[PDB]
Ligand binder design. Structure first.
Ligand SMILES: [Mg+2]
Ligand SMILES: [Zn+2]
Ligand SMILES: [Zn+2]
Lengths: 152, 94, 54, 283, 258, 48, 65
């Protein structure tokens, strides 16, 4: 998105700084991770596009569940340094354990993050209003109470 | 085939396996997952082009047995299954 | 404290000094490049260059 | 394959899919100057000024012309030719050989010797180069959908339909809704219907075979009318959760190949006036 | 227990059911057959005269593409390191006519083109084509020229058709037309999916609630076919033996760590 | 430096010395277009 | 310019079956029946024979020596 580039024949140039001061300037000022937030409107410019959002929805949608091998393989593929799987979310028939998408996604978030908002999939405002009321009445709701009112 | 150790712990082993790809890696990890003493095991290709022949592994156990021993058990089970499949194929094809 | 312009300028001066023959003020792993040596000196806090502000 | 990139099978490429050959013709005149001085086709002696390395004259004949079917590399001399000297020197012969373009490569295909309108000798040499598809090569269907090869996948990694079909190409389902090219989706069904019934399908603009006829005919042949087939993942060996749309689509290889676009300059030469780097890949 | 049942058997195709095996081992066998089983193939050509309308690099590809028979007894085809034995194919043609694969003369009687009718190039009057081609053992992953055949499989599934559907007779007739084994029962019709079976458009509503499906665990319907380089049984046996040799080598390398 | 060449139209043997030749032509037909024939040395091609 | 030796997708050799298919389909026999007789089940192979065009025969007229 920052380059406004798509892989349909676009060509892009590359330059190599030749002096140590120029290399230091490029390394300190011009690193990509420095410019995540756009200066035009104070919002992110680098972010997930297309398949990233679609896969996120597929992973975190209601009813999504994964098996032992899928969870291990996807965590190893993502590069997460996990060494012990969490408790299974539900048990399938034949005794197989299953993990929900929420649990898998939560392993990537910082340990102390807290936030709530409304996304583009909101279609029944009563469901969101109930959750907002529950969060407003006490700033720390019981997770087992939120999971009864969970809505996409 | 070469084993190049990346890092190891009391119950963790992480190693490259050069000269291999998904064909043997997936079978090995799926055989390992049958062992009840393996807590976490998986493999990945760090890059489909440069690391096409270098699948990275990670094996973690609960301390009952050494990961290097679980690997031996899995590789022996693979051999037994292959041989017993071959006998049935020979007996059925003629 | 430091603006990113000041940090970049200090690191660029230190890297050039190290490359031209100045000794490194901290031990470094072998094979490192002078720019990384200057960056290491910086985050370790050993900087002998100060910035003038009106 | 995101953002209009496409993924192609390695085995199909190795079997002769989209394999192409590139041609380029070089020209060399034996000019006749005023006062009787003239050029000459010959092996450049080491004495002459501008004499490049002996390495580059490895593929020349005594008449000054390259042997056909000999493989050449960058800046290799095709036609050796010397020119009358320049008065700043004297008693010298400028080296004015015609050489391959600096970044090109191939095999000499044919050599032609003719006479110009003035009787001076004229030599034309054409060099052919095999172009196997690689990363960065541009492919486009006739419905306006274009892209470049993002990855070349081994055959055993590609998923296969449960009826025994392996895709030759994989495209992202994301460009379809935004581009609104339903005709490509209809052609995908029509191609498989034609290949299964044994005869081609007419796709004329306003009188072609309607979609509903093709959908019924596909169901008649034993497939599903939606054109969706069950595939198994090529890595894990288990079937994907959703049915996958697969068909046959006409695709074209464009002449925008990465082998002609890549270009890098370390120091190069400089322009005479502004003393700045020259312009273009050729120089 | 592990067992193998043959369903079809012909000149260059074998259809069989594998039971008791996990999906991982089945996919490993498929990949081993596709990529690991070695065959003979042309890898380098030495042209002497080529006046045909096709360049050298096209004729070379066409020569490489031709299947060549591979003897099974003379070589350790299951070894993880292959021999470098070389077989030379020579040809000389002239005048009008189509050059066929049967015109290739080999040094070794055990290595020769499988199909003697494959066209190579058309020659006009006064055109000559003389060359020598060198063939060597190679695996199916380095280049597709060395593939021994083509393999795929599918789950062994039983499709259940409830007789509560008003017109299940049409479904039974379609299933018998497709050639699948149909075992009619009370209130329910069982169709064994030896080959893919897609329900028609009008019955698509009945899918799931009435037309449900059952997947028999650890059972896969394999399909192996060859171009004639090796018999299919030899191909399967070689793949299975390579699977054992790889495990043995892994055991050795792992033991080396102690 | 004598060398052999092939005519463009009739494709016949023409032997000529270009360095001294003034009127380049096939003797059999007035064509001024000639090929340089391929050499007879063996050449090696990778069957990729 | 000439019939390919093997199907691009699966790899089955179909180089020898083109002329037979063309002759039988010209004679009047149903193209699908001819293809099924030749043993080309998967449509990946049938595409290669159905869509092929013979173009070696009209470039042979120009020679380069
Ligand atoms: Mg673009
Ligand atoms: Zn003539
Ligand atoms: Zn095919």
């Amino acid at each position: 998105p920052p380059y406004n580039a798509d892989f349909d024949g676009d060509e892009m140039n590359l330059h190599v700084p030749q002096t140590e001061e120029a290399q230091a300037e490029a390394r300190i000022l011009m690193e990509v991770q420095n410019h995540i937030i756009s200066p035009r409107y104070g919002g992110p410019i680098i972010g997930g596009i297309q398949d990233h959002i679609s896969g996120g929805y597929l992973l975190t949608r209601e009813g999504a569940y994964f098996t032992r091998d899928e969870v291990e393989q996807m965590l190893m593929f993502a590069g997460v340094d996990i060494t012990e799987l969490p408790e299974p979310d539900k048990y399938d028939e034949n005794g197989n354990p299953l993990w929900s998408g929420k649990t898998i996604f939560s392993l990537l978030l910082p340990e102390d993050l807290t936030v709530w908002y409304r996304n583009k999939l909101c279609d029944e405002p009563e469901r969101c209003e109930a959750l907002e009321k529950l969060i407003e009445e006490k700033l720390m709701p019981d997770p087992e109470e939120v999971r009864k009112l969970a809505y996409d | 085939m070469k084993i190049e150790v990346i890092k190891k712990e009391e119950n963790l082993l992480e190693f490259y396996l050069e000269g291999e790809d998904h064909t043997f890696a997936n079978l090995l990890v799926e055989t390992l997952r049958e062992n009840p003493h393996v807590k976490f095991t998986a493999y990945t290709i760090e890059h489909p082009i440069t690391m096409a022949r270098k699948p990275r592994f990670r094996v973690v156990t609960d301390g009952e047995i050494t990961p290097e021993e679980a690997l031996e058990e899995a590789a022996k089970k693979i051999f037994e299954r292959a041989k017993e499949v071959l006998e049935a194929w020979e007996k059925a094809v003629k | 404290k430091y603006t990113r312009f000041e940090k970049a300028r200090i690191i660029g001066a230190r890297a050039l000094q190290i490359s031209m023959g100045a000794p490194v003020l901290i031990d470094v792993p072998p094979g490192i490049t002078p720019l990384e040596a200057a960056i290491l000196e910086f985050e370790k806090g050993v900087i002998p260059i100060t910035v003038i502000r009106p | 394959n995101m953002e209009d990139a496409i993924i192609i099978n390695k085995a199909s490429i190795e079997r002769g899919l989209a394999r192409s050959t590139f041609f380029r013709t070089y020209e060399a005149e034996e000019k006749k100057y005023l006062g009787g001085q003239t050029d000459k086709f010959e092996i450049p002696d080491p004495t002459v000024r501008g004499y490049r390395g002996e390495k580059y004259y490895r593929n020349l004949d005594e008449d000054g012309l390259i042997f056909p079917e000999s493989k050449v590399e960058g800046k290799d001399v095709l036609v050796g030719r010397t020119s009358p000297p320049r008065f700043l020197s004297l008693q010298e012969r400028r080296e004015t050989s015609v050489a391959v373009r600096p970044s090109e490569k191939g095999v000499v295909d044919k050599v032609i010797i003719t006479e110009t309108g003035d009787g001076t000798k004229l030599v034309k040499v054409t060099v052919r180069d095999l172009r196997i598809p690689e990363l960065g090569d541009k492919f486009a269907s006739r419905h306006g959908q274009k892209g470049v090869i993002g990855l070349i996948v081994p055959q055993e990694d590609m998923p296969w339909t449960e009826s025994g079909i392996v895709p030759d190409l994989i495209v992202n389902p994301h460009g379809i809704p935004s581009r609104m090219t339903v005709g490509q989706l209809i052609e995908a069904i029509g191609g498989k219907v034609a290949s299964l019934k044994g005869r081609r399908v007419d796709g004329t603009a306003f009188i072609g075979e309607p979609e509903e006829k093709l959908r019924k005919e596909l169901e008649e042949l034993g497939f599903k009318h939606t054109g969706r087939e069950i595939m198994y993942d090529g890595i894990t060996g288990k079937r994907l959760e959703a049915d996958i749309f697969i068909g046959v689509i006409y695709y074209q290889r464009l002449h925008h190949m990465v082998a002609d676009k890549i270009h890098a300059r370390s120091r190069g030469p400089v322009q005479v006036l502004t003393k700045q780097p020259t312009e273009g890949r050729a120089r | 227990g592990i067992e193998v049942q043959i369903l079809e058997k012909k000149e260059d195709s074998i259809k069989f059911v594998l039971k008791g095996v996990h999906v991982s081992f089945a996919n490993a066998l498929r990949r081993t057959i596709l990529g690991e089983v070695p065959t003979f193939a042309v890898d380098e050509v030495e042209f002497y005269e080529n006046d045909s309308a096709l360049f050298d690099e096209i004729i070379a590809h066409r020569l490489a593409m031709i299947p060549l028979t591979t003897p099974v007894d003379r070589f350790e085809l299951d070894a993880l390191e292959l021999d470098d034995y070389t077989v030379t194919l020579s040809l000389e043609a002239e005048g009008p006519g189509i050059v066929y694969s049967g015109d290739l003369k080999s040094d070794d009687p055990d290595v020769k083109p499988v199909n003697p009718n494959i066209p190579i190039v058309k020659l006009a009057e006064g055109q000559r084509l003389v060359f020598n081609a060198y063939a060597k053992l190679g695996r199916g992953k380095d280049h597709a020229k060395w593939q021994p055949g083509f393999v795929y499989y599918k789950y062994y599934t039983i499709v259940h058709i409830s007789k509560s559907i008003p017109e299940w007779k049409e479904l039974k007739k379609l299933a018998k037309k497709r050639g699948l084994p149909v075992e009619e029962t009370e209130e329910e019709v069982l169709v064994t999916t030896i080959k893919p079976f897609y329900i028609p458009k009008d019955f698509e509503e009945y899918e799931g609630k009435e037309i449900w499906e059952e997947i028999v665990p650890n059972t896969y319907i394999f399909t192996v076919e060859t171009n004639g380089e090796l018999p299919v049984e030899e191909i399967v046996s070689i793949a299975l033996k390579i699977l054992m040799r790889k495990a043995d080598r892994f055991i050795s390398e792992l033991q080396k760590l102690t | 430096v004598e060398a052999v060449y092939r005519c463009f139209k009739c494709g016949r043997e023409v032997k000529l010395d270009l360095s001294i030749t003034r009127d380049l032509r096939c003797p059999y037909c007035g064509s001024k277009i000639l090929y340089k024939p391929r050499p007879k040395v063996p050449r090696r091609v990778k069957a990729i | 310019m000439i019939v390919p030796v093997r199907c691009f997708t699966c790899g089955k050799v179909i180089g020898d079956k083109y002329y037979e298919f063309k002759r039988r389909v010209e004679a009047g026999e149903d193209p699908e029946k001819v293809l099924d007789d030749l043993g080309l089940e998967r449509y990946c192979c049938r595409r290669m024979l159905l869509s092929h065009v013979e173009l070696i025969d009209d470039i042979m007229h120009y020679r380069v020596y």
